[PDB]
Amino acid sequence: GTSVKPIFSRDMNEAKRRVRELYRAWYREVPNTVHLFQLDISVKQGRDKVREMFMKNAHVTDPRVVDLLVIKGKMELEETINVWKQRTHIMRFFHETEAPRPTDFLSKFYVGHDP
Amino acid sequence: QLIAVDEKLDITTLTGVPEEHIKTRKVRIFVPARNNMQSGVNNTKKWKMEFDTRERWENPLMGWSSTADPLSNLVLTFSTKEDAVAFAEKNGWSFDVEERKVPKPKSKSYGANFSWNKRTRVSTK
Amino acid sequence: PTTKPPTARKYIWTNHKFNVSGTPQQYVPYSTTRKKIQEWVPPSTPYK
Amino acid sequence: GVRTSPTGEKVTHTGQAYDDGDYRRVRFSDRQKEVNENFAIDLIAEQPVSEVGSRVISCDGGGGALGHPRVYINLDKETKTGTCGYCGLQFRQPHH
Amino acid sequence: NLIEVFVDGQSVMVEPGTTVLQACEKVGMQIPRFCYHERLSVAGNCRMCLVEIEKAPKVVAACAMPVMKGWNILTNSEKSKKAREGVMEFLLANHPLDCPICDQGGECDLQDQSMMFGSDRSRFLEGKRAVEDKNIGPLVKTIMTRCIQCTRCIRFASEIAGVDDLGTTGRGNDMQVGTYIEKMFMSELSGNIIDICPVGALTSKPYAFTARPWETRKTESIDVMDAVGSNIVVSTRTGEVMRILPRMHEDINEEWISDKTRFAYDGLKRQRLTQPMIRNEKGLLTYTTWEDALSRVAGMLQSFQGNDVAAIAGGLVDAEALVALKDLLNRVDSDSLCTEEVFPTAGAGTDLRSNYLLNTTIAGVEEADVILLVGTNPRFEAPLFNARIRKSWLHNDLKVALIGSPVDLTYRYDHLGDSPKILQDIASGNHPFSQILKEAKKPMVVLGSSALQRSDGTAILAAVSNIAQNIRLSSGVTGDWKVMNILHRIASQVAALDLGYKPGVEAIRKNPPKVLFLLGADGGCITRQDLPKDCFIIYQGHHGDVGAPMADVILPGAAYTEKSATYVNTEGRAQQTKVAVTPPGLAREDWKIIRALSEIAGMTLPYDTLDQVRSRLEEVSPNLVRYDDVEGANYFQQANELSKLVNQQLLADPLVPPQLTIKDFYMTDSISRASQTMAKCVKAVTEGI
Amino acid sequence: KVDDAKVSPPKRAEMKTSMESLIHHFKLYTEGYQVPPGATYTAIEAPKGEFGVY
Amino acid sequence: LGLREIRIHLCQRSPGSQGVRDFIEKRYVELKKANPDLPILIRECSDVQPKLWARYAFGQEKNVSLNNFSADQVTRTLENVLSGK
Amino acid sequence: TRPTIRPRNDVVHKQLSAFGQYVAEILPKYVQQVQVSCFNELEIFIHPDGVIPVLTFLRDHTNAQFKSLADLTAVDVPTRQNRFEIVYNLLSLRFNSRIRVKTYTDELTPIESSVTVYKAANWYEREIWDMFGVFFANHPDLRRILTDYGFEGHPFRKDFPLSGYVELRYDDEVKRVVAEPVELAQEFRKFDLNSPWEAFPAYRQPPE
Numbered sequence A: 001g002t003s004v005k006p007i008f009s010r011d012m013n014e015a016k017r018r019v020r021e022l023y024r025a026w027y028r029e030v031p032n033t034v035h036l037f038q039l040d041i042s043v044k045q046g047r048d049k050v051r052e053m054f055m056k057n058a059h060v061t062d063p064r065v066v067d068l069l070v071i072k073g074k075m076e077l078e079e080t081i082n083v084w085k086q087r088t089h090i091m092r093f094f095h096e097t098e099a100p101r102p103t104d105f106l107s108k109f110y111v112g113h114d115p
Numbered sequence B: 001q002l003i004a005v006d007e008k009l010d011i012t013t014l015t016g017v018p019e020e021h022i023k024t025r026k027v028r029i030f031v032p033a034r035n036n037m038q039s040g041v042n043n044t045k046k047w048k049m050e051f052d053t054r055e056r057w058e059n060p061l062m063g064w065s066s067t068a069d070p071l072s073n074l075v076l077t078f079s080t081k082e083d084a085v086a087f088a089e090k091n092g093w094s095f096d097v098e099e100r101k102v103p104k105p106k107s108k109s110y111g112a113n114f115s116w117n118k119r120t121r122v123s124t125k
Numbered sequence C: 001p002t003t004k005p006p007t008a009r010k011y012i013w014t015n016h017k018f019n020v021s022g023t024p025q026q027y028v029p030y031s032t033t034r035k036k037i038q039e040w041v042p043p044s045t046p047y048k
Numbered sequence D: 001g002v003r004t005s006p007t008g009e010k011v012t013h014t015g016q017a018y019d020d021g022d023y024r025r026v027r028f029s030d031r032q033k034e035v036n037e038n039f040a041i042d043l044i045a046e047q048p049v050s051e052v053g054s055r056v057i058s059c060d061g062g063g064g065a066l067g068h069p070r071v072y073i074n075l076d077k078e079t080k081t082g083t084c085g086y087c088g089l090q091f092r093q094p095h096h
Numbered sequence E: 001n002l003i004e005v006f007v008d009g010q011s012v013m014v015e016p017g018t019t020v021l022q023a024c025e026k027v028g029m030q031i032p033r034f035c036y037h038e039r040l041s042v043a044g045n046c047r048m049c050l051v052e053i054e055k056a057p058k059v060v061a062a063c064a065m066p067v068m069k070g071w072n073i074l075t076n077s078e079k080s081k082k083a084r085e086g087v088m089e090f091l092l093a094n095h096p097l098d099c100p101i102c103d104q105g106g107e108c109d110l111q112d113q114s115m116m117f118g119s120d121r122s123r124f125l126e127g128k129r130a131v132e133d134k135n136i137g138p139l140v141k142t143i144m145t146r147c148i149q150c151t152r153c154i155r156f157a158s159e160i161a162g163v164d165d166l167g168t169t170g171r172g173n174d175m176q177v178g179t180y181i182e183k184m185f186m187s188e189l190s191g192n193i194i195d196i197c198p199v200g201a202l203t204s205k206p207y208a209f210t211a212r213p214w215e216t217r218k219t220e221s222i223d224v225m226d227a228v229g230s231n232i233v234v235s236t237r238t239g240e241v242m243r244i245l246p247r248m249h250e251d252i253n254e255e256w257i258s259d260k261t262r263f264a265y266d267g268l269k270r271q272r273l274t275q276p277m278i279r280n281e282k283g284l285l286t287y288t289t290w291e292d293a294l295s296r297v298a299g300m301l302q303s304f305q306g307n308d309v310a311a312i313a314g315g316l317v318d319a320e321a322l323v324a325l326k327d328l329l330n331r332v333d334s335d336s337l338c339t340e341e342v343f344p345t346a347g348a349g350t351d352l353r354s355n356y357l358l359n360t361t362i363a364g365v366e367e368a369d370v371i372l373l374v375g376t377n378p379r380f381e382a383p384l385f386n387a388r389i390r391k392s393w394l395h396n397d398l399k400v401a402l403i404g405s406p407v408d409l410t411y412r413y414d415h416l417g418d419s420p421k422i423l424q425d426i427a428s429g430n431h432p433f434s435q436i437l438k439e440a441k442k443p444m445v446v447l448g449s450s451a452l453q454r455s456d457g458t459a460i461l462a463a464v465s466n467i468a469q470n471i472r473l474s475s476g477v478t479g480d481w482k483v484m485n486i487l488h489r490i491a492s493q494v495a496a497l498d499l500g501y502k503p504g505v506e507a508i509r510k511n512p513p514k515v516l517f518l519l520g521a522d523g524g525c526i527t528r529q530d531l532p533k534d535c536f537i538i539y540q541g542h543h544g545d546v547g548a549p550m551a552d553v554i555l556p557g558a559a560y561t562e563k564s565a566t567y568v569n570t571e572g573r574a575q576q577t578k579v580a581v582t583p584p585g586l587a588r589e590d591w592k593i594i595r596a597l598s599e600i601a602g603m604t605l606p607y608d609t610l611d612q613v614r615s616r617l618e619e620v621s622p623n624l625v626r627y628d629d630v631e632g633a634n635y636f637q638q639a640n641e642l643s644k645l646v647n648q649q650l651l652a653d654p655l656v657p658p659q660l661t662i663k664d665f666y667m668t669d670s671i672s673r674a675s676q677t678m679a680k681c682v683k684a685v686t687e688g689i
Numbered sequence F: 001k002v003d004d005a006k007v008s009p010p011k012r013a014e015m016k017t018s019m020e021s022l023i024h025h026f027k028l029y030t031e032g033y034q035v036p037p038g039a040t041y042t043a044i045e046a047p048k049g050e051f052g053v054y
Numbered sequence G: 001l002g003l004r005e006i007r008i009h010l011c012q013r014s015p016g017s018q019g020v021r022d023f024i025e026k027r028y029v030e031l032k033k034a035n036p037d038l039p040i041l042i043r044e045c046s047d048v049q050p051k052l053w054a055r056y057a058f059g060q061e062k063n064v065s066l067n068n069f070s071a072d073q074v075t076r077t078l079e080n081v082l083s084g085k
Numbered sequence H: 001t002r003p004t005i006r007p008r009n010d011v012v013h014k015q016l017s018a019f020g021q022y023v024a025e026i027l028p029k030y031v032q033q034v035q036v037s038c039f040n041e042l043e044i045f046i047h048p049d050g051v052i053p054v055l056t057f058l059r060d061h062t063n064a065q066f067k068s069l070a071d072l073t074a075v076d077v078p079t080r081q082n083r084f085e086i087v088y089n090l091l092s093l094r095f096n097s098r099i100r101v102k103t104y105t106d107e108l109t110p111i112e113s114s115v116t117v118y119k120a121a122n123w124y125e126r127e128i129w130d131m132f133g134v135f136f137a138n139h140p141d142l143r144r145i146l147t148d149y150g151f152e153g154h155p156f157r158k159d160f161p162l163s164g165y166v167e168l169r170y171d172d173e174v175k176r177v178v179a180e181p182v183e184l185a186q187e188f189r190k191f192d193l194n195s196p197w198e199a200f201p202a203y204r205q206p207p208e
Ligand code: SF4
Pocket: E095, E096, E097, E098, E099, E102, E103, E104, E105, E106, E108, E109, E110, E111, E146, E198, E199, E200, E201, F023
């Protein structure tokens, strides 16, 4: 439909405002997450990971998609603040046990049939 | 009032699929071919969307067929080619569309088996 | 069994075996099918 | 009738036996290979051939409801026996 | 005009003469049937299709009764349901209990129609009938107790395959379908009786007992065993090619496939190349790594350049691999690129597609009035093209005329001599067949590409082009009808020609190469005797037949069931085969191997994905990426004018096809030679019994 | 069980002596019976309360 | 500098290739007879503009758009490629 | 009599049809369609923005006292423009009856939360969100209920694979459970069970 129902934020400006508010909320939480969960990472590493997770959705140009993304981000944050998660999930954000997947054509050709 | 989004729909960031299986997957939208072993045509009514085939290897123990592709068994049913194309586009996968093949109408006549001067006459019944 | 002995078959085991787990007599699984793909065998005679 | 491979490993009734250079033979070290010593092909060969004076015979495997579904075997080709394939049982018309 | 009938009260407009079954199909109802096949004649004996007309007191066989004006067809009426139940009851009353041991199993029309239209209980309290099994070859396994005497195999045999060795012997309940003698039903189209037999009486013998229909995964790909490009379906199970089935394409395949296509899938499991191979100090081939093999090949490629680099393309190569190899060889200014099949390069040559394409499509044969076959055996070179010719012959009284060797075609044809002297005479007009062609409204001239392999292929091509020109001049020039045609017999030939490969290995023979890339080249046209001493050979392929024994480096590749690839058939239509399984062992995709070799050599190619390689294919020739389209431009005037300028003399040798018999049909290429079933077929047709 | 061999399996003796019964047993244990299109919500008084299935 | 092959892509139905089709119709035979050993590959396009590819030595290729050209324009462009100017 | 055929209830069918007409007349603004299945189950298809008014009417109206929210779920149909189909099953104890209310929505369109009408809607809508990705506007606490913490994707969608994309195991190097891409020792075997012969003539569709 031409007149799509907005979740909120109307245009993209208010969506960006909500994105920045959620980013501030996550940024001020990383020291507490490191302290409580007794993570062995640095605070800088946690902030960098929050920044990277925010940046992987930087190409979104739909206000409704942005609103859903910030809703799910707030959900993830409230999981972390209430210590509902464990160190398991917080470290699952880091993919610490995966082998470095090759990205060049020659290495992909050598390892297997993966495109 | 009600906002307007003059852009193509895209829910790839919300579906949760990994980027590898979003970018490097080419689905196939088509109407399945009739199973040649049967004359029934009721399985060639709806369009189907299926993914490309990935590697399967042999399990070192018990010799089973292992896999590493999550979307190996994922087949979706769509009533129309347009519906399937829209779904594939909004989910971000590549897609190849194949047009439905319907048999051409044919002229059948029982009396052609006994033609007076044509080769259509049959030598047995 | 003393009053009603079971039917005797030529394939039924004569000696019963208990649970042999934890012993060198334990069951070990394996594939019961042969090799699907035959590899090409290059000639033993050099071409030159 | 079990047979021994050149690597010393018994062959099953399906002909399964790892090659000499196969690493998977290590699983049987300090343990045993589960092989059934009774071969159905050998046993059914041991079974004789029945002779009935009719063109068509009916086989259900014996026992009635305990056997296989009833099938009919046509005993017209005298150069070979008619084999019920559910149970692999051979029937034959009395020639001569 | 169309008449108006009714199906369950719904108005349908149908042509006069349309059957009740066809009217119901048009409205959307598939009437149950056993003996009825749309591609076969109308038999009307199984009586399963009986339906009720609204006022008629008697049910009518829907497969044979033409509709009349104002007929209301009651498909789901009580009378129709009772008739279907009775017919199914009789069929299953005499049918045997073999479902668990019967390969038809879960894809049985008798089972499905019993479950959808018949009762669920048996009133048969008597003994059943047992029928002696027959033996009609190593391909079809017959358990004739399961036959329902639907006469599909007989009708198919006669009408389609032109072989009348099947029929019913005796009468009554003792009627049996077979040969009545120990004769094998050996023909190049004998698997379609397996396909169309509604019950398990006729089943595939190589596929016997292996799998069940619900387990198989169906991958829709195409065929590469010949140049017809038949549409097939590969049935796999746990990553293994289990079966090959026809896929309907009425303009190419039409639900039928040849036996070589259907039963040579087992050749993909033997003599397979699975690891890269090099040669040690003693000259014996040993397995190695991709890195080492590609490093050696890249070192040689960097060492040499110019026309000292050659590629020979085999018969099962794809457009992606061909274009990748062409670009790789052009990166070193080398141009000794050739295919192992000769096409006359004098005049237009490969410049015009309407000079080596089958200008009238396969479906266009049904519209032709007269057809003239020159130097070909379509029964074995392209069995489905011959089947289409047979269909046109039967249903239109087509006048088939064959110049040259009197092969056993499946229909009556006019045999014109054995030499191209008749070909010259027809062009001149002395032969009466010149008058026949001139009077014919729609003539067609098909020159088999097997005749172009002769030393005077250019002269034969010029002669047939002159015949087509004479036809065009005398007849009306106006019209979209195309006369001149070339029938190919190699899957990769048309794609290679479109890309720009020089046909035939004459360039290699003229200038021997220091480095030779055999891309699936198992034809044996070029050997180390022709090549100079210390020549470096890299064979890239999926089977080790000739090139692998005579190569220095061996690169395993993928088959048509194992790669997504582009093949162009003899009429110019492009098609893509999809991935059914993955290449075994360390084998990789062909274009991927070529691209990796280029990257190691330092002349990296500009494509890294299948989409980019097909974009390169589009750059070279967009017809390679327009898939289902077959229409093209006609440049016969230019081709004929260029062929006229240079002329040579026809050899005084009779035209003899390479394949004169069904054994020659069975053994044609690498997969067929590696197949066990093809060897069994050859033994059966040679030694008999 | 409902005396409808297109829904419920027949007896072993009927399967091993009747062609229709064998066919129906095969189809019921390989493909299963087809259920006409439609949606239902049926609830019962299970011991823990209303247990329902949609 | 060293030409290796030349390819012409012309859509069959689109009016933009009317001039290109004229060159093939009544000028190709003279051109090919002038260059017997030059591969001139004629192919068809679907909806893209007509194009003229020229593959030189060591895999160097250039494409020239032939949209809305006439028979004279196509002849002059092809002569320019053959000449090297 | 037919022992194997379920008997029909014309009385209940007529009562349900009359009540469907009643509600359709009362609320023309939202009621798009009314149906009564042949096994006596009333269904009402309404516009998605009428959920609160329709549920409040069916709960508080004297002639429709559907006090109990029996069930609340969603059905995913990818071929539709609005794939998600929200279903409410209501029970009326006073009149001893059941009703069904069906609305439609897609990924990005919220559905008004019905926790002000029935309290069970809280957890039911939490489950709907967790399993399909449908967002409910005024939910007191909307979060995952059944999936793992930090789980990505909504499992019950038709396009979500059966085994998912990740699997868990204990990694001794990091002394914790880790999530790694899914990899099955034996792949799930897909069976094609549909027969190619039409089973029910009554449900045949026009060929179009
Ligand atoms: S042909 Fe059909 S009905 Fe007959 S035994 Fe085979 S599966 Fe059963």
